[PDB]
Design a protein around this ligand. Structure first.
Ligand SMILES: [Mg+2]
Ligand SMILES: [Mg+2]
Ligand SMILES: [Mg+2]
Ligand SMILES: [Zn+2]
Ligand SMILES: [Zn+2]
Lengths: 669, 668, 223, 221
RNA sequence: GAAUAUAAUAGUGAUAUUAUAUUC
RNA sequence: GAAUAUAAUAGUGAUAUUAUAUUC
RNA sequence: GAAUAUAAUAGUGAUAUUAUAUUC
RNA sequence: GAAUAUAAUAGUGAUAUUAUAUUC
């Protein structure tokens, strides 16, 4: 079958004794086989006439499918029916029967959450063992923590019926916003309480075996300087001031910062509610200000990109923006702004092409890559950046740089927003990931971020963090990329806050390990008592925790102030989604075929819908097939709420914050 | 109901088994004639045998009316009455439906489609076919196709029994005959198309018929045109301002039809203008498109102004420029709209003065005033040529204080199937059921009704406002005023109209004379001549291109943007055309369809338009076809371009576009 | 076409929610339109790969012809084939194919009784909605009660397969020879049992409207 | 990454015809099966759904197919399951079949359950796919299944029967000595599987012969 | 334990013997 | 369409903005 | 989306353009 | 030709008679 490493057996030992356990071990030490061990033992412990039922939680589709495959192939020959349920296969199926007629079930926790809430799965007593992959996520309003809220509610209640053993796999329990050992210990105790765990399993007796399988990569800190001469920022700043002058001309903080972004966002939102007796003029003005603020925002983003990369990257970002402004129908003001950008475009591109105006950070990065690949041409590199724009920018920079000809950069990003033509699909991710190897097409992989450990990929002996700030958990997790001996990790940045934050994270790891060592010396009974104490406290707090405005409201377009609909026309589906009735609304919007047609709930996305008045094309929401009907689904964040009586205009980001008389959707209407 | 003698007379040839064309005035009650014929026909069969009748109505209202009447009438006699139309034609066993019913009311297109398919292998399944409005049995009309099947079986070696054929009409027509001989020729050809050997008309009971259906007295009103021409002056140099604008972009009698024809030709000529710079080609072509469109609208406005108020034309242009806005900002549209808005003041100053009035409207007002003064209980029906003129005259009536006694309603067609125009069937039914003596409406403005149609409230006053028609429509319209004292007024400013109506009267004379002459012939001889004409027409009918397999580009006719390639095009049911690939999905926007219908295996969901820089040019529709949600495009929305040569060609219809058409396959 | 009065929607509501229902409302309040509402909703509720089949029961030829005409003219537009079978058109015809190739079938109950008896219609599962005009007749040896005997025998018996929703239409359910409340409730419950009805729908929230439409005449006694 | 000859082999099946796909070993039958299953399952309208059953007569092939199908069809929202002798007993088989769109099955399971009555009819499936369909003969489990199928077909029953796809590299000719006897044998095999079409690669022979090469055979006496 | 297939060898064949492999 | 987490940035905090990622 | 008819205007005509109406 | 329902009158009732209406 397989040869179990001794430290794996050591980690699995408390769990095999039936104790609720949080297994904490280095990333890539083989958690799958520990899971298989604990599960196999758990199933094989039962006598004749009785069986066990294991559930395995993974909050990512790839890990879900991987673990499903592994568990199936491993266990069914033993005679245990293995299955899994995800969002794709959750609708119109008897979950109760599926759970009942199977011995090992792999879930995305939201499935169990929804089925518990719906009542289909009446109790967690049906399971005899629950395993949480990346159990550190069991906090706040996370699905894991919801499931555990159900568990703890049943536990601390007078409810009888047995409860399943709880195992939690992680590489770092975390310490939260701790400053010293005691705070960290309290946090870890809180996490153990959230998982009903009385044991923290770590490797102690087999450390030398573990340290030859999993090596800790050496970390280096690269502090560099920002570009000294920036005429680009001067030109873009002038364009910004001009746009501000136009905006101020219609109606009456350093550029390239996050503060100016927050400001211009606040300003746009504040402009969305500008009132005038003449409504056509109000429309023209609000649209004007919207366009101005949008262009200012784009200019700002460009300045940031230029700050973190080439000037060509920022200029191409702007060119792409103004290109998308075209093919969408020019407004008079859009024409003015496009002209104003076009006049400066020659000077901008001229300054951009100048090799003297290069970013020092890219030079230092190029130096690091050069040295490392010089010492070893077979180097496998992964490069983390904050934004997808910086991803594309850095791939373009690598492919464009003659000094880095030995590199064959690949892209790795999230799946993007569900209703936008961005990101990267899952099979595309898979495709690029299987091509990323020594005997593959890609040498270096440029990525944004990855939730937790995830699927193991080709080992990287070089990990570069390009202006990358994270927590202690993801810091410890990232080590899994370079498990081999001599693996190196650089942290390149031009601001001391990042390096200092990394140092803080390392100290937090020290506090974490020390706190774990301290907790492991406690008696299990005392620890269980403290756990029950924290659980009871949190349950009291949890158990402890507005009039609907029946007045008819107008939902207007945030860009045109055009009448989209009335709240009387709006109907709510399954207490979360919001559609509009009446054939009058049908002429208020246009539609484009959806870029990411997926089937969530009983809804099937067909198209996105936009405003139709005077080529506004502001995003209003989507258009879906819901059971028998073909209906539009709108988001409140696209509209201004004007009270018909008082005339007061308001903005709401989420429907749950919009407290009006919400009439349920009824087919009998 | 107890039969009138002329109905028994008209029915008698049919009841004797003769293939007959029944020709009698509108409103004499053809329904009960059909009921008599069907009843006798079905009841004539012995025990071991059974008859099967099929009734053809070419309109949904007539279809439903006849279905209901036949159902109520023949249910008690033991005969099952059913009906099939487009709404209930899909996914139903037509063969079983026909087989398990004795009387089937049918839209002819259903029978044509099922004959072409093979579900109904032969017309031998029927023993009696009845064509409502049998004068439509000509050319490529569904009736004529059905009869092509009939005659192909007859003249052919097929020994299978053919059904008796009855036609119903108030006028067989004479075509463009100049004399009695040519008229008789045409009528004989119609009798041949329907395989009729007898033409049934009232003879021995004319005195009875004339006391049920009275011929309304016709009056001819020739008035003077607009002597004034200030409005036309303004709009004219507006039009050569626009024409100069269009001329200042590329090289190379307003208010008339010739100018409309010409400007259509000009637009279609500008659509194929090419350049090295394709973007400037796009800009210039869009420019020319806009200019030509504005010129067209100005021309239309002039026509409206000559046939109605200047205010109506100005409101037409106002609505047009209102829809130019809310579609998007265009530099040129802003320019033109400005150029119009600057002269709006003078235009409305001219459209406000009361010295400005159309003598035609004043004469119409005089007629209405006199008639309603003589009789306030008058129920008027007013026919015009266009829906624009419908709305115009409605507004003119409701505006004029001297017509306060009028309660104007509207009656138009259903308009083009994929546009937000016209009027739905239940709306028509609503206004019509309101249009009565003691109803809500006194006068009903309308365009044209297909043949006779359902009987509406009797109109003792009919007015033809600039309205020409054939002899069939002239004879049929008399049904609107069957009561004695009914009057008709042909109001116009053209001698052409009057002359053509007089020509129509003479054609009616020729028709009746030719019929009466034909009714004297020996039936055997007539059957011989009919067989002769049928054989000749079949010989002619059975008379005697290679598809260009080279890939082509489909560009937008307005902005010359690339929609798709012919290689991406697939053909569904040998008629419809869809596009494959995710690329095309990025090329168009869509709006929910204004008239969602379930034609064929398709269900209309949306209209699709060009997406590039708010071009918004109609490309077609978006439909639900079985399991798939797919776009369907019309070729008349695109310019075809060859890859190699670079030629640009236009096609108004897909069947004229002889390229390599790949059948749509679900397995792709 | 017209437009539904509120109390008609109120009466139709339990039926549209799929409940077996006896609709009891004053004569002339407009029951045909209620029937049309229920039928339209019922037929339009099915997904693409499915279809409903409604049967309407009138025990009089005039009502039969009336309902046949109305339903035909109404549902022809929506693409639902409407037919009917009376005693005059029931012989030497394939009843099973007629029922199969139609979405709405108006029927004299005796036709269905005889065809269930012969076996030409093997089960009521072919229908998804049965409507009984004047449902109070569902008692003793009335054809309605025979049909519902078949229905109930399929329900309670080892017999399965889907049973059609059952609607009844009346102005009065009756109380039989009841002498008090309990006996009347006994009778009404037994009628609901005969029709397999779980809900009795009456006007409550829109009484004012109905009373403005349907007035109770003043009764005088002349000895 | 579908090859053209795979699409060619899958085309008759995708058109709803009962088909015996005959193609060289190693040309990639799994992907053809995946295309067929995918198209078949997606063809059904909203108010309906299909149910595929895949017969493998060996445990390794069973496991492999179950794995590939589960990994492939998970994203498409189709529940894939499997039943073998290792997980056959004390578990509601009918409930499993009902609660899954694709069922990978060793034929003896279906034989046992059909004869036991837990699966009342093959009408529960809309598509059956016999791996190595040349075994559909004599008293083989495949042939027993098809005996149930054909008994239902030729019987008075009006219940809908599933589409039938057979997969093989060789239909065989039995003890045929001439083309007529071989023709009769092959026709009999098609009758055993209710097949009306034999799918072979015709238009993409170049591609196929570039993917699969015929090894040279030497005779050593 | 039972069932199934293929090959060889006997018999006109049904079938049988062995080998090989598979399944419940 | 909605929900969730992490990070940065404002606020005493609740929370808010953006970025990033995940899920139904 | 497609098909059909009528009328007017161009052309010797096939036909073409627009208007109007109808149907699948 | 047959079946069904309601009402009145008889009978403890089953049921019967007539009237009335409906259906095949
Ligand atoms: Mg006009
Ligand atoms: Mg994160
Ligand atoms: Mg009675
Ligand atoms: Zn808008
Ligand atoms: Zn365009």
């Amino acid at each position: 079958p397989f040869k179990p490493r001794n430290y794996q057996l050591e980690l699995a030992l408390p769990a095999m004794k039936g104790k609720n356990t949080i297994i904490c071990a280095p990333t890539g030490c083989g958690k799958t086989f520990v899971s298989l061990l604990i599960c196999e033992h758990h199933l094989k412990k039962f006598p004749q006439g009785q069986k066990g039922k294991v559930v395995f939680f993974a909050n990512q589709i790839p890990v879900y499918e991987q673990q499903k495959s592994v568990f199936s192939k491993y266990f069914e020959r033993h005679g245990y029916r293995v299955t899994g349920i995800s969002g794709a296969t959750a609708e119109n199926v008897p979950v109760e029967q599926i759970v009942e007629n199977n011995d090992i079930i792999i879930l995305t926790p939201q499935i169990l959450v929804n089925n518990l809430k719906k009542g289909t799965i009446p109790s967690l007593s049906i399971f005899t063992l629950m395993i949480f992959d990346e159990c550190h996520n069991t906090s706040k309003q996370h699905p894991y923590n919801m499931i555990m809220f159900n568990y703890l509610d049943q536990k601390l209640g007078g409810s009888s019926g047995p409860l399943p053993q709880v195992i939690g796999l992680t590489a770092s329990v975390g310490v939260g916003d701790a400053k010293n050992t005691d705070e960290a210990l309290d946090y870890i105790c809180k996490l153990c309480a959230s998982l009903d765990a009385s044991v923290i399993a770590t490797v102690k007796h087999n450390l030398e075996e573990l340290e030859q399988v999993v090596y800790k990569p050496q970390k280096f800190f690269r502090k560099v300087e920002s570009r000294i001469s920036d005429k680009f920022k001067y030109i873009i700043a002038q364009l910004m001031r001009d746009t501000e002058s136009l905006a101020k001309r219609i109606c009456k903080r350093e550029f390239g910062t996050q503060k100016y972004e927050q400001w211009i966002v606040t300003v746009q939102k504040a402009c969305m509610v500008f009132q005038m007796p003449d409504k056509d003029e109000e429309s023209r003005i609000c649209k004007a200000l919207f366009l101005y603020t949008s262009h200012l925002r784009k200019y700002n983003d460009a300045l940031i990109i230029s700050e973190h990369a080439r000037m060509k990257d920022a200029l191409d970002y702007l060119k792409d923006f103004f290109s998308n402004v075209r093919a969408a129908g020019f407004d008079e003001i859009e024409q003015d702004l496009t002209q104003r950008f076009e006049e400066k475009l020659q000077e901008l591109e001229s300054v951009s092409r100048d090799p003297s105006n290069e970013n020092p950070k890219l030079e230092d990065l190029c130096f690091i890559l050069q040295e490392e690949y010089h010492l070893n041409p077979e180097t496998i590199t992964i490069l983390f950046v904050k934004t997808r724009a910086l991803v594309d920018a850095l791939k373009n920079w690598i492919e464009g740089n003659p000094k880095l000809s030995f590199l064959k950069p690949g892209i790795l990003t999230g799946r993007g927003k569900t209703n936008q033509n961005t990101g990267m699909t899952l099979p595309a991710q898979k495709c690029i990931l299987d091509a990323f190897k020594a005997s593959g097409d890609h040498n270096i992989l440029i990525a944004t971020s990855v939730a937790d450990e995830g699927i193991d990929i080709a080992q990287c002996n070089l990990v570069i963090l390009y202006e990358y700030v994270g927590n202690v958990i993801k810091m410890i997790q990232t080590r899994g990329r370079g498990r081999a001996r001599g693996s190196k990790c650089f942290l390149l940045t031009s601001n001391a806050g990042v390096i200092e934050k990394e140092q803080i994270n390392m100290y937090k790891e020290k506090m974490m390990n020390d706190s774990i060592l301290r907790l492991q010396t406690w008696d299990e009974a005392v620890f269980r008592e403290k756990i029950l104490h924290i659980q009871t406290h949190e349950k009291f707090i949890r158990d402890s925790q507005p009039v609907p405005d029946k007045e008819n409201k107008k939902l207007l377009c945030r860009k045109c102030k055009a009448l989209a609909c009335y709240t009387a026309d709006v109907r709510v589906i399954e207490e979360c989604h919001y559609t509009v009735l009446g054939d009058a609304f049908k002429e208020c919007f246009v539609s484009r075929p959806h870029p990411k047609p997926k089937q969530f709930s009983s809804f099937e996305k067909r198209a996105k819908i936009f405003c139709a008045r005077q080529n506004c094309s502001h995003d209003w929401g989507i258009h879906v097939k819901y059971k028998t009907f073909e209906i539009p689904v709108i988001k409140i964040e696209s509209f201004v709420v004007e009270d018909i009586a008082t005339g007061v205009q308001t903005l709401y980001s989420k429907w749950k914050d919009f407290h009006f008389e919400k009439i349920p959707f009824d087919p009998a209407e």
